[PDB]
Design a protein around this ligand. Structure first.
Ligand SMILES: Nc1ncnc2c1ncn2[C@@H]1O[C@H](COP(=O)(O)OP(=O)(O)OP(=O)(O)O)[C@@H](O)[C@H]1O
Ligand SMILES: Nc1ncnc2c1ncn2[C@@H]1O[C@H](COP(=O)(O)OP(=O)(O)OP(=O)(O)O)[C@@H](O)[C@H]1O
Lengths: 234, 243, 271, 233, 242, 239, 273, 238
């Protein structure tokens, strides 16, 4: 993995296109709440989804993740991330921040760049959650080059171009998401443009303080999606 | 063609041409000889000057490995010096052992397999040098030459550089003239003749000479360069043989 | 040579009946038509509008349908040739003939031309040491040098075509000459939108419409086959004698024809 | 036309050449000049400096090893630096193991034994510069030449790099003269300085584009850069 | 189709000299010296509005009194600053005193040389070299507010002031024309804005850029989103006047 | 494929068939037999220049006070094999308390050649060998090696570019008296049969220096010198 | 040239010599039959009398032997190229003939063509290696779909054919440029049953005959094997001087297929299970 | 071909060959009722002289609650079992409880990309079937591939036309489909996909899981030739 004469890298002008194939997901930064939302294969028959590895994953009592792209190269990070979580709670006696492990894993995706015979990932991820003993939301986005950012909304996947600009006709800085019913309406009113099917093809999750995690049924989705399946009419 | 690109790739002919290219590198170097006298050995070498700015007599090309040895080379200046720095510690790790100086067959048996090791692998450069050494042990006189394929044989005389064709036939013209035995001092005359006789392949340029011998008789079989009128006695002589 | 050239017989291909797109199509009318509407505007800011364009391939996805629609609209000449028909046994015959167009383009200020599938002319500059085939390479040089030796551009217009570019076409094209290297490929919805926007004209759908689900699930395909999709419903009508227009048998054609050309579908790996 | 024997090092030519090396030695040809010479008692370093713009400070050309040694380089700094930091250990090691302080010429005969340990192993390039070493010991003063080859030689005075033949020629014009100098380094120094004007492609030396630093049978190593060299221009 | 440690017939290496134009893809990053203080400036390359540009950090703080600004490829340089922080603090231990700048910065450019025969006894880390370069600013009590420049080829120069990146070849010319000895600090807190307003692809905001001074009295200081804005009006106090 | 020790497209090893031919650089032929309670081994000794010290030249080595060997190949390649022999005798008896046989020690160095065909850091060796010894349990015996690992005894054999010239000539002999080895006791009085057979079958006449000799005497191995050969040559005074 | 042209000497085949093939005629005649039988009927809707069609399937079928009979019971002409004869060892000969080709059928609307093989005009790629043949596939397709082809597609339907499908240019097919394709698979057993009824019409008041008792057994692909076994069955009777024939003499003729049904030797390589 | 790097457009050169290569291999299916489990495999060869009787190749076990099936190399899979076996009982000398699967695969297949990730070494030409039970999630079923991504299912195939064969389970499978009501689907799932419709009890291999022993014990029952030979008649082949 070397430098082209166009200031680029061959293998990494490539890799981040891999994440542009697979599933599509997003979260946001509500007024006082934070949420995620992702994708599933409807029509996957002869199967029980209780036990499949969810695109969501949890890392601590109070933080979670949502990958995209590959699935193998995702599982590895959670492990060595989990280590740093339930180790950082020990030596220093305080739990994590959000930026710490983000700063960490921002570094590991180049420790697996600059060496001999090591591919980078077909992975891009983001995180979300509230710091301990605070209230302000925090979410950070990642990609194999290591550059960790803080997007108020971030999506990686298929048909995502207009999705990357769909929010900008929808979100307002000085008009943030009021409540969950609208902020989740936001969470779904984005993703549904690529869904092209019912509720079965997705999975979502949410955070509130002091580790108030929830996951919502296929049926709870069929409560609210109808309300805009009713309001996609007038 | 396509097999002539790296070490350790034999040919259908049954060879690796790469070292055979090394022979032309050492062909691109200075003249150098060393003679088996009646009681020791001799060393003498070509040392060409480019500009006057080069100092005389501060830039020897002979190297010593231990007391009872002299060694020279021709071609690649550094590479022929490396194995000396291997030589200078090896025998030192042999006088370490039975507390006696080292034989000359001990030398090549502890060198002539070394350079071989730099022709087994696809990761190193064959020592593009031909090399001489000599001296004395309990047994008596010895002499040897090396070639970069590890080989070596006990000669009465040798030659390298582009001073090959002159000296070889000349020594053929010498030996029959004097097979009875040639003592130390006398060859120091007749040696420096040959270098003045062998520069004619490169008589565009200039040089100055450098000589060393070692006698069981004279110097207790120790190594001792030349520095004195004895050298000047020979250059005054060697001009006559070309006169 | 002249015989094939003057194809003044535009079909009933109806420009603006086609429902494809706009921006491309203004881009040509802006390239061509509006320059023939009030070109003083180019003289206002002092513009030399372009010397024709080049679309790309993506076959069966709307290479030409506009073009004969433009011919239906052309309001000028229209020309048509083939390089394979242009070439001959002897040396420089066609090259001697290739010159003879531009004077026949010098015929008119309303001087325009389509060209037919260059893929055997000017493809790529192999050395062609292997005999014979240097004729092609000897011919393209007879054109491009003729094209821009010393030309006021004389409304010496052009529009070209192919099916694949990077397969060929290394150096022939140059900007200004052909500034607009432009595209046609699948819309990802608008085949659903305006294609049957056209084909709703004749048919009745004699029980319903059903069109709210006779639709695209981001299905990789080419809407050109939609003119099969209309077909076989009528046939399957008459595989069972339906003189009317159904929506139910219409199902099969996508389930039948779109199902043949299968893809790998290896996306049990990017989840 | 396209020598495939141009890749890694170890590949000899079909004529006895290492095309990496020969194509390296032209580097210093694209580098600048730094000259030097000696009497029987005093030796000199000299170096044009090569500046970036009208704002920057200047690229350096001289470094001290230790109290009785200095040097000067040509072409590349970074691969040339480490050799300086290298032999400091091999000049401290002397003055702590022995205290019988360091003779100059063995350093070169150490230094040649370094680069050769970098040519004949896969990976690694030569320390591709030429450079000039100076100093004093019990044996008088000595000057040296360096090649990334390994060749190092005891010279009276020489030159390096671009435009250098003009200055190189003054020395053969003058080697009868400057060898007989002693205890009077001032006029000695301006020998090269006048002589390297032969190189000036109208850049017209200044207070600061030049660096000089010398040694003697008495002097420890001293540098004359900054603004002290109004003496000479 | 070249490698790392192989020369050319021309001598000019390929990869490192190719590493000397990746910077020209990146952002802009300028710092200018005044004999009573030095400035630093940036171009965020903010791509979308929803983003919260407090998180993007093209500017750092080594200590209470030294800062730097990375340009080109912001990712990789995030590593090397932790090197500098280690040697700074380490030198703050063995001597109980802040370090000279030139003692530090030799180290950093002694790091990026590690891709083959680094300092004395260096195992070759860094399969490839750092595709990033940066500027160093701060005081030590021997030479003055000696700015320093670093580039991954493994050399440093000292400057009055210059630039990097996108606007390099053009912008510096104005700086080459318009620096001298006897200027102020805040004139340099605003002269950059005359420049950076040139080579931004949109009208300036208080959030496109941000600034940070440096002073032997207080030490290090980043400004706020608004305290850039007030001086821009001060620039428009001259852009509207003249 | 034609530069390394992978398996060929069809399934030979082009880098190895070369190595057999890397031996034939010298135009040299050697020979091996079994005595009654002794053995013999010989080869040409060419000297196409005047200045050598043929005191020094040799291919026939000395590994114990028991055994010996020979080479028809490049001697630099030989010496690395030569040295590794002396080692691999010692470490045997130091671990078991008795001298090194031949049948084993070939079975070592034959194992060794394989892991020069099974890896690629290594250059193989363009030589072959014919070890010679008595054995207190097996008697007079020899063993041959290739660079691959094929090692086998021989009641009597030879090697060089010109095996066909003589190897037929020997098989014709045993089809004339029909026993394994010779019915003659003293080594001194059977070397004549060797040198009688070389020049006659297809070989060229020889002189004093032209040849060299080894004998694996009972509890003794050793070479021979000038008059020791010249005398043994003058056995031809009677025939 | 008119040697390629159709014939006043039609072959003598028929699409009821063709047992087992029952459905395909209904699926493919109409595009070749109906709207050209009744354009006013089709023009009642007038969707698109499509361009030609294509047939894919292995050998053993008689796709040819189908195409021989369709040229009987036509109302139209049936020309033949004698596939790949059109090309010559030159360049200019390509496009002119194709120019000559279409026009030869413009003058005959109720008339169509035949290919057998398009393995030799497939999958054009070029970087210096290629050939003039790729030049001609364009202009035919050009004059297939251009200002002058739909007037043929007003007058014409056509067909292509081969035995290997996916080894050609997809840029050929704009579906609509070819509006329908079909498989000619190998037969069923009972589909094979009525076959031998066709060709063995040689029994002589014989008995003990179980025509079903052979596709009883077969797992082949061809229908022609029904002839290959039948044709050499009578050879036995031909040699033994008795014209008559039976089941068992007819059955061991599969012994000739004992090679074909078993010529495919097998590897023992259990590298992977 | 430099296993590490990607395509010019985000793909791999090797590994897409591997899970496409394994399609050459045999068949191994695996299903589940709410009552019990079935497995099957068709041996690549069923010649007569060799020891197809005790030929335990496609179906191995790991402990007294688990069984698997195999698809790929004889050897490069033959080591993983000796590996993973240890990671089972080495779970036990720490904790002394029985092992769950959901730790195993997630803590096993991550070895896979470890050889895609570095070393220049090839990945593993292997895919698995899984089967077993824990007291916390009931009966179970899982699969794998040379990548590492694992997927839970109710019934699956691999190998020859597994995409085709997976259809054959699509319509017929039932939620409460019992064991003896589901077993016959398997060999019927194979009775169609076979190359040799001429079918032999010899050619295949079989396994079972139940909870047959009262007091909630289970049975890693594996079935011998003449048994399944007679079972074969039950669905009515001959
Ligand atoms: N937007 C559209 N509306 C209607 N038909 C379309 C559309 N796009 C493509 N088609 C169909 O595609 C077919 C041909 O399209 P296209 O112009 O790409 O190829 P072509 O010009 O026939 O091929 P060639 O140029 O090689 O002769 C037509 O039959 C047409 O019905
Ligand atoms: N149902 C059938 N009716 C009549 N003939 C058949 C039938 N099935 C097979 N055949 C025979 O098959 C032969 C040709 O079929 P096959 O597909 O093997 O070759 P082909 O179609 O001539 O080859 P190609 O299509 O490549 O030119 C004819 O001899 C024909 O008699």
């Amino acid at each position: 993995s070397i430098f082209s004469p166009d200031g680029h890298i061959f293998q990494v002008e490539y890799a981040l296109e891999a994440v542009k194939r697979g599933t599509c997901a997003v979260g946001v930064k509500g007024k006082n709440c934070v949420v995620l939302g992702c994708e599933r294969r409807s029509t996957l028959k002869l199967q029980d989804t209780r036990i499949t590895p969810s695109k969501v994953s949890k890392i601590d009592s109070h933080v979670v993740l949502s990958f995209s792209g590959l699935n193998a190269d995702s599982r590895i990070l959670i492990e060595k991330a989990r280590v740093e979580a339930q180790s950082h709670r020990l030596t220093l006696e305080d739990p994590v921040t959000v930026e710490y492990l983000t700063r960490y894993v921002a570094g590991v995706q180049q420790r697996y760049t600059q060496s001999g015979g090591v591919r980078p990932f077909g992975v891009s991820t983001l995180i979300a959650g509230f710091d301990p003993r605070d209230d302000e939301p925090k979410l950070y986005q990642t990609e194999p080059s290591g550059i960790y950012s803080s997007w108020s909304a971030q999506t990686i996947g298929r048909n995502s171009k207009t999705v990357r600009e769909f929010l900008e006709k929808n979100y307002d800085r000085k008009e943030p998401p009021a409540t969950v019913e609208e902020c989740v309406k936001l969470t779904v009113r984005s993703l549904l443009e690529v869904v092209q099917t019912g509720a079965k093809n997705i999975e979502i999750t949410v955070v509130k303080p002091d580790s108030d995690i929830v996951a919502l049924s296929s049926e709870e989705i069929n409560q609210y999606v109808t309300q805009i399946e009713q309001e996609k009419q007038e | 063609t396509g097999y002539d690109l790296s070490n350790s790739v034999f040919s259908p002919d049954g060879r690796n041409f790469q070292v055979e290219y090394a022979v032309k590198a050492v062909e691109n170097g200075t003249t150098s000889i060393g003679i088996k006298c009646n009681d020791g050995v001799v060393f003498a070498v070509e040392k060409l000057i480019t500009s006057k700015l080069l100092v005389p007599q501060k830039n020897v090309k002979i190297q010593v490995v231990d007391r009872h040895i002299g060694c020279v080379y021709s071609g690649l200046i550094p590479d022929g010096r490396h194995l000396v720095n291997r030589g200078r510690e090896e025998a030192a790790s042999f006088k370490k052992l039975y507390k006696t100086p080292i034989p000359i067959p001990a030398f090549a048996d502890r060198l002539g397999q070394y350079v071989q090791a730099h022709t087994l692998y696809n990761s190193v450069r064959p020592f593009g040098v031909s090399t001489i050494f000599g001296g004395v042990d309990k047994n008596g006189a010895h002499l040897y030459m090396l070639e970069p394929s590890g080989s070596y044989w006990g000669y009465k005389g040798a030659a390298t550089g582009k001073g090959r064709q002159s000296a070889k036939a000349e020594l053929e013209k010498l030996v029959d003239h004097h097979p009875e035995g040639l003592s130390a001092r006398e060859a120091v005359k007749q040696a420096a003749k040959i270098i003045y006789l062998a520069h004619e392949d490169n008589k565009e340029k200039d040089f100055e000479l450098e000589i060393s011998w070692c006698s069981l008789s004279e110097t207790n079989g120790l190594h001792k360069f030349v520095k004195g009128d004895l050298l000047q006695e020979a250059i005054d002589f060697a001009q006559k043989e070309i006169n | 040579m002249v015989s094939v050239m003057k194809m003044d017989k535009s079909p009933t291909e109806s420009y603006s009946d086609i429902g494809g797109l706009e921006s491309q199509i203004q881009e040509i009318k802006e390239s061509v038509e509006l320059p023939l509407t009030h070109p003083e505007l180019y003289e206002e800011m002092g513009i030399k509008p372009p010397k024709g364009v080049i679309l790309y391939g993506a076959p069966g996805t709307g290479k030409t349908l506009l073009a004969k629609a433009v011919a239906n609209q052309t309001s000028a000449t229209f020309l048509r040739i083939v390089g394979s028909e242009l070439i001959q046994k002897y040396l420089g015959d066609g090259p001697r003939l290739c010159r003879q167009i531009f004077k026949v383009a010098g015929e008119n200020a309303p001087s325009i031309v389509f060209i037919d599938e260059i893929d055997a002319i000017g493809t790529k500059r192999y050395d062609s040491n292997s005999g014979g085939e240097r004729e092609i390479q000897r011919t393209m040089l007879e054109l491009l040098n003729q094209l821009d030796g010393f030309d006021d551009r004389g409304d010496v217009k052009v529009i070209m075509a192919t099916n694949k570019i990077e397969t060929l076409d290394p150096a022939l094209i140059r900007p200004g000459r052909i500034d607009r290297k432009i595209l046609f490929e699948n819309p990802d919805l608008s085949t659903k939108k305006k294609i049957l926007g056209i084909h709703t004209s004749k048919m009745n759908l004699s029980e319903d419409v059903n069109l709210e689900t006779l639709v695209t699930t981001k299905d990789d395909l080419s809407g050109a086959d939609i003119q099969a999709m209309c077909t076989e419903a009528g046939l399957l009508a008459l595989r069972e004698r339906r003189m009317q227009v159904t929506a139910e048998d219409f199902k099969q054609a996508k389930e039948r024809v779109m199902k043949n050309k299968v893809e790998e579908n290896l996306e049990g790996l990017y989840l | 036309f396209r020598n495939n024997y141009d890749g890694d090092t170890v590949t000899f030519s079909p004529t006895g050449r290492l095309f990496q090396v020969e194509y390296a030695l032209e580097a210093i040809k694209q580098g600048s000049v730094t000259v030097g010479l000696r009497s029987n008692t005093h030796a000199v370093l000299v170096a044009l400096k090569r500046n970036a713009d009208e704002l920057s400070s200047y690229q350096k050309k001289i470094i001290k090893c230790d109290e009785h040694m200095g040097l000067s380089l040509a072409g590349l700094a970074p691969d040339a630096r480490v050799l300086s930091n290298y032999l400091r250990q091999q000049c401290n090691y002397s003055s702590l193991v022995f205290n019988r302080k360091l003779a100059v010429e063995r350093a070169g005969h150490l230094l040649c034994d370094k680069a050769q340990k970098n040519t004949q192993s896969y990976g690694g390039r030569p320390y591709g510069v030429g450079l000039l070493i100076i100093g004093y010991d019990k044996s008088g003063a000595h000057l040296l030449e360096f090649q990334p080859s390994g060749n190092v030689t005891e010279l009276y005075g020489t030159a390096i790099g671009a435009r250098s033949q003009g200055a190189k020629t003054y020395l053969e014009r003058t080697l009868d003269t400057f060898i007989k100098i002693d205890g009077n380094p001032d006029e000695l120094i301006k020998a090269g300085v006048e002589a390297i004007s032969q190189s000036l492609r109208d850049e017209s030396l200044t207070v600061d584009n030049l660096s000089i630093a010398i040694v003697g049978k008495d002097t420890p190593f001293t540098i004359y850069d900054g603004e002290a060299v109004a003496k000479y221009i | 189709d070249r490698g790392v440690s192989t020369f050319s017939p021309e001598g000019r290496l390929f990869q490192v000299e190719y590493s000397l134009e990746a910077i020209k893809l990146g952002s802009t990053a300028i710092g200018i010296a005044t004999k009573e203080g030095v400035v630093l400036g940036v171009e965020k390359r903010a791509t979308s509005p929803l983003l919260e540009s407090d998180s993007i950090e093209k500017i750092v703080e080594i200590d209470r009194h030294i800062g730097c600004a990375m340009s080109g490829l912001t990712a990789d340089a995030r590593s090397m600053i932790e090197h500098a922080r280690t040697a700074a603090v380490t030198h703050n231990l063995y001597y109980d005193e802040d370090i000279n700048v030139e003692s530090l910065t030799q180290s950093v450019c002694d790091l990026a040389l590690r891709f083959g025969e680094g300092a004395s006894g260096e195992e070759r880390l860094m399969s490839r070299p750092f595709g990033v370069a940066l500027l160093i600013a701060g005081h030590d009590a021997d030479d003055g507010y000696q700015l320093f420049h670093a580039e991954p080829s493994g050399t440093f120069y000292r400057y009055n002031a210059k630039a990097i990146g996108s606007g390099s070849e053009g912008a510096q010319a104005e700086l080459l024309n318009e620096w001298h000895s006897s200027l102020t600090l805040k004139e340099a807190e605003l002269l950059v804005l005359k420049i950076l307003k040139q080579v931004m692809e949109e009208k300036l905001d208080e959030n496109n850029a941000q600034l940070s001074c440096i002073t032997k009295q207080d030490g290090f200081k980043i400004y706020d989103n608004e305290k850039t804005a007030e001086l821009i009006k001060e620039l428009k106090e001259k852009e509207a006047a003249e | 494929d034609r530069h390394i020790t992978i398996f060929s497209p069809e399934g030979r090893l082009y880098q190895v068939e070369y190595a057999f031919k890397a031996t034939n650089q010298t135009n040299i032929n050697s020979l091996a037999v079994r005595g009654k309670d002794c053995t013999v081994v010989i080869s040409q000794k060419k000297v196409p220049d005047k200045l050598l010290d043929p005191t020094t030249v040799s291919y026939i080595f000395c590994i114990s006070r028991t055994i010996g060997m020979v080479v028809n190949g490049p001697i630099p390649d030989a010496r690395n094999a030569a040295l590794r022999a002396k080692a691999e005798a010692a470490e045997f008896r130091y671990k078991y308390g008795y001298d090194m046989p031949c049948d084993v020690l070939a079975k070592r160095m034959a194992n060794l050649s394989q892991i020069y065909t099974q890896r690629a850091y290594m250059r193989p060796l363009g030589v072959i060998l014919t070890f010679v010894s008595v054995d207190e349990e097996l008697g007079p015996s020899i063993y041959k090696t290739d660079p691959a690992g094929y090692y086998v005894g021989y009641k009597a054999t030879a090697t060089g570019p010109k095996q066909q010239e003589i190897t037929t000539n020997l098989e014709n002999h045993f089809k004339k008296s029909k026993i394994d080895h010779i019915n003659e006791e003293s080594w001194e009085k059977v070397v004549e049969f060797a040198i009688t057979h070389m020049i006659d079958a297809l070989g060229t006449e020889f002189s004093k220096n032209d040849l060299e000799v080894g004998v694996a005497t009972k509890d003794k191995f050793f070479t021979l010198s000038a008059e020791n050969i010249e005398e043994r040559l003058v056995a031809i005074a009677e025939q | 040239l008119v040697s390629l042209m159709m014939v006043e000497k039609v072959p003598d085949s028929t699409y009821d010599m063709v047992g087992g093939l029952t459905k395909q005629i209904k699926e493919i005649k109409e595009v070749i039959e109906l709207p050209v039988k009744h354009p006013e009927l089709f023009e009642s809707l007038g969707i698109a009398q499509p361009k030609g069609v294509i047939l894919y399937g292995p050998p053993g079928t008689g796709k040819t032997l189908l195409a021989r009979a369709v040229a009987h019971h036509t109302d139209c002409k049936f020309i033949r190229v004698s596939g790949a004869e059109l090309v010559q060892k030159y360049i200019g000969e390509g496009s002119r003939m194709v120019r000559e080709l279409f026009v030869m059928a413009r003058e005959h609307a109720p008339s169509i063509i035949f290919m057998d093989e398009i393995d030799s005009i497939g999958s054009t790629r070029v970087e210096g290696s290629g050939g003039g043949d790729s030049e001609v596939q364009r202009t035919m397709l050009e004059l297939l779909n251009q200002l002058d082809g739909f007037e043929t597609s007003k007058n014409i339907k056509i067909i292509m054919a081969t035995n290997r499908l996916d080894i050609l240019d997809p840029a050929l097919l704009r579906p609509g440029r070819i509006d329908r394709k079909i498989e000619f698979p190998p037969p069923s057993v009972a589909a094979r049953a009525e076959i031998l009824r066709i060709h063995s019409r040689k029994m002589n008041l014989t008995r003990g005959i179980n025509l079903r008792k052979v596709a009883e057994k077969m797992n082949g692909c061809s229908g022609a094997d029904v002839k290959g076994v039948c044709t050499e069955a009578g050879m036995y009777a031909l040699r033994e001087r008795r014209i008559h024939v039976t089941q068992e003499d007819f059955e061991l003729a599969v012994g000739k297929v004992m090679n074909k049904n078993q010529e495919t030797a097998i590897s023992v390589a259990k590298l992977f299970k | 071909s430099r296993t590490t790097i990607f395509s010019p457009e985000g793909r791999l050169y090797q590994v897409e060959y591997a899970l496409e290569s394994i399609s050459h291999a045999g068949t191994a299916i695996g299903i589940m009722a709410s009552d019990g489990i079935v497995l099957a495999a068709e041996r690549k060869v069923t010649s007569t002289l060799l020891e197809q009787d005790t030929s335990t190749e496609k179906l191995y076990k790991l402990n007294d609650k688990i069984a698997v099936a195999v698809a790929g190399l004889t050897a490069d899979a033959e080591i993983l079992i000796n590996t993973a076996r240890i990671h089972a009982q080495n779970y036990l000398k720490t904790y002394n409880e029985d092992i769950p699967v959901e730790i195993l695969v997630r803590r096993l297949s991550d070895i896979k990309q470890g050889y895609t990730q570095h070393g220049g070494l090839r990945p593993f030409g292997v895919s698995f079937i899984y089967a077993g039970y824990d007291d916390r999630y009931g009966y179970q079923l899982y699969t794998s591939n040379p990548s590492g991504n694992y997927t839970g299912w109710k019934a699956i195939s691999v190998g020859a036309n597994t995409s085709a064969a997976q259809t054959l389970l699509q319509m017929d499978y039932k939620d409460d489909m019992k064991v003896d009501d589901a077993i016959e689907l398997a060999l019927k799932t194979l009775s169609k996909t076979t190359d040799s419709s001429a079918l032999t009890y010899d050619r295949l291999e079989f396994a079972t899981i139940r909870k047959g022993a009262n007091d909630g014990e289970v049975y890693q029952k594996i079935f011998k030739p003449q048994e399944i030979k007679d079972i074969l008649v039950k669905t009515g082949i001959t």
